[PDB]
């Protein structure tokens, strides 16, 4: 493999209550010390990391995420995005529903952990001054909604890419007020019950931290980068969700967006001169243009259920996760002068 691929961590959660009630057996097995998973006891996939159901939040973060976050201090953009079927563990893994109740709980996921690490590293970079800002949006039924509110349009600037016109941002100072923004946005994120997840995310959420870094003795030059922390909505099937009405139309919109994402992953996984990548098909894929194929170090956390009743869905995630690893990104150092 040449260049800088998208990196992929496969995270299998434990069986959940619904699966135990339905009498499901585990259909995934793991090869200890190797980043491989075997599915339907027949097909094997390899990723950059494989985390079995016993893997704690802290291990997922320290092994797969932390090294990436430390790269922002070199001036890189970075993205972590969670991808998989409804109920698979995206929100859990990302801390997409974190509230202050979870502070100091070992169950906290990626976004609160990132915030802790950023301020730990800032504290050790005494020679530098930092400015952090955050925005937090959801894509809900084809609309971009600002989660830091108690219309927004994409414009593509001809130089330097996508601009989300109307989206607000908060400048943050310390860890506490940074994580408060997560909490604030999570109180607004559209969540509702289906049979597959009592706390299903009905939107794709993107928490973005903008970081500017300047050396104190050389203050004309800085680095300016962005960290995108993405808790996608997940594929769902009406026969399993039992959704009707507004809930069903949410699932339709979600599924349609995730098809557009699959199209982008598939085009990029087989990229070459003159190829076309259909970023423009959805608002989601427009916002992920640098994250997938562009100026970003990117990790996908592909989330799966171990239950045999979800074999088809799990196979789909594994296949797209395998394609994602063939995506080549081009992260540069984001100098500003």
Ligand X SMILES: Nc1ncnc2c1ncn2[C@@H]1O[C@H](COP(=O)(O)OP(=O)(O)NP(=O)(O)O)[C@@H](O)[C@H]1O
Residue 289 interacts, among Mg ion, ligand X, none and using kind-specific CB cut-offs from 5 to 8 Å, with: none
Q: Is 230 in contact with 291 (CB distance < 8 Å)?
A: yes
Using rule CB under 6 A, residue 204 touches ligand X:
no
159-177 as b/e, with b when 16 or more CB fall inside 10 Å? Answer: eeeeebeebebeebeebee
From candidates 93, 178, 186, 201, binder to Mg ion by CB under 5 A: 201
Among 99, 176, 187, 199, binds ligand X (CB under 6 A): 199
Stretch of 110-118, 176-184, 199-207, 309-317 lying at the interface with ligand X (CB under 6 A): 199-207
Q: Site for ligand X (CB under 6 A): which residue of 91, 282, 317, 329?
A: 91
Residue 139 within binding range of ligand X, rule CB under 6 A: no
Does 241 participate in binding Mg ion (rule CB under 5 A)?
no
How many binding residues for ligand X (CB under 6 A)? 18
Print the SS3 string covering 193-258.
CCCCCCCEECCEEEEEEEEEEEECCEEEEEEEEEEEEEECCCCCCHHHHCCCHHHHHHHHHHHHHH
The item of Mg ion, ligand X, none sharing an interface with residue 86, based on CB under 5 to 8 Å by kind, is ligand X
Q: Who's near 317: CB < 8 A, 6+ residues apart?
A: 83, 84, 85, 88, 302, 303, 304
Q: Is 84 annotated as a binding residue?
A: yes
Q: Does 135 bind Mg ion (CB under 5 A)?
A: no
Q: Which of residues 149-188 bind ligand X (CB under 6 A)?
A: none
- In whole angstroms, give the CA distance from residue 162 to residue 140: 19
Applying CB under 5 A, which part among 86-94, 177-185, 235-243, 249-257 lies near Mg ion? 86-94
Written as six digits, the tokens of 3 are 């260049």
Q: How far is the CB of 223 from ligand X (least distance, A)?
A: 32
Is 88 a binding residue for Mg ion by CB under 5 A? The answer is no
257 near ligand X, judged by CB under 6 A: no
Longest dimension (CA), the chain: 64
Identify which of 267, 242, 280 has the alpha carbon closest to the alpha carbon of residue 18: 242
| 265 or 307: CB nearest ligand X | 307
Asked if 85 contacts 305 with a C-beta cutoff of 8 angstroms, the reply is yes
Q: Does 201 bind ligand X (CB under 6 A)?
A: yes
Selection from Mg ion, ligand X, none that 92 binds (CB < 5 to 8 A by kind) is: ligand X
Q: Mutual orientation of helices 311-324 and 245-268 as an angle, nearest 10°?
A: 40
Residue 89 CB, nearest distance to ligand X (Å)? 3
- For the chain, how are helix, strand and coil distributed in percent, rounded to 5? 35, 30, 35
State yes or no: 86 annotated in a binding site. yes
Burial class, 15, CB count within 10 angstroms (exposed 0-12 / middle 13-18 / buried 19+): middle
310 binds ligand X (CB under 6 A): no
* Span interacting with ligand X, options 121-129, 133-141, 196-204, 212-220, rule CB under 6 A: 196-204
Listed in sequence order, the residues at least 6 apart from 172 whose beta carbon sits closer than 8 Å to its beta carbon are 132, 133, 134, 178, 181
Residue 303's binding partner among Mg ion, ligand X, none (Cβ under 5 to 8 angstroms by kind) is ligand X
Q: Does 234 belong to an annotated binding site?
A: no
**Beta pairing partners, 9:** 49, 301
Binding site as annotated, residues: 84-91
Binding site as annotated, residues for ATP: 84-91
Residues that bind Mg ion (CB under 5 A): 90-91, 201
Residues that bind ligand X (CB under 6 A): 13-14, 16, 84, 86-92, 197, 199-201, 233-234, 303
């Amino acid at each position: 493999v040449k260049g800088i691929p998208v990196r992929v961590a496969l995270r299998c959660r434990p069986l959940v209550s619904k699966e135990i009630k339905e009498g499901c057996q585990t259909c995934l097995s793991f090869v200890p010390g190797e980043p491989q998973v075997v599915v339907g006891n027949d097909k094997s996939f390899t990723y950059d990391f494989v985390f079995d159901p016993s893997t704690e939040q802290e291990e997922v973060f320290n092994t797969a995420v932390a090294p990436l976050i430390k790269g922002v201090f070199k001036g890189y953009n970075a993205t972590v995005l969670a991808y998989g079927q409804t109920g698979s563990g995206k929100t859990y893994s990302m801390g997409g529903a974190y509230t202050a109740e979870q502070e100091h709980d070992s169950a906290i996921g990626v976004i609160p952990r990132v915030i802790q690490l950023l301020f730990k590293e800032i504290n050790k970079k005494s020679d530098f001054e930092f400015t952090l800002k955050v925005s937090y949006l959801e894509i809900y039924n084809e609309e971009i909604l600002d989660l830091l509110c108690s219309q927004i349009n994409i414009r593509e600037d001809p130089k330097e890419g996508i601009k989300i016109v109307g989206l607000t941002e908060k400048t943050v100072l310390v860890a506490s007020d940074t994580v408060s923004c997560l909490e604030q946005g999570n109180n607004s994120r559209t969540v509702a019950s289906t049979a597959m997840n009592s706390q299903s995310s009905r939107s794709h959420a993107i928490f973005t931290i903008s970081i500017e870094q300047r050396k104190k003795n050389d203050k004309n030059s800085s680095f300016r980068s962005k960290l995108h922390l993405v808790d996608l909505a997940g594929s769902e099937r009406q026969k399993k969700t039992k959704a009707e009405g507004d809930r069903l139309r949410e699932g339709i919109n979600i599924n349609r967006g995730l098809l557009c994402l699959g199209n982008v992953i598939s085009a990029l996984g087989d990229d070459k001169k003159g190829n076309f990548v259909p970023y423009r098909d959805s608002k989601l894929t427009r916002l992920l243009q640098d994250s997938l194929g562009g100026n970003s170090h990117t990790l996908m956390i592909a989330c799966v259920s171990p239950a045999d009743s979800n074999l088809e869905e799990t196979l789909n995630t594994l296949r797209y996760a395998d394609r994602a690893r063939k995506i080549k990104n081009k992260p540069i150092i984001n100098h500003h002068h």
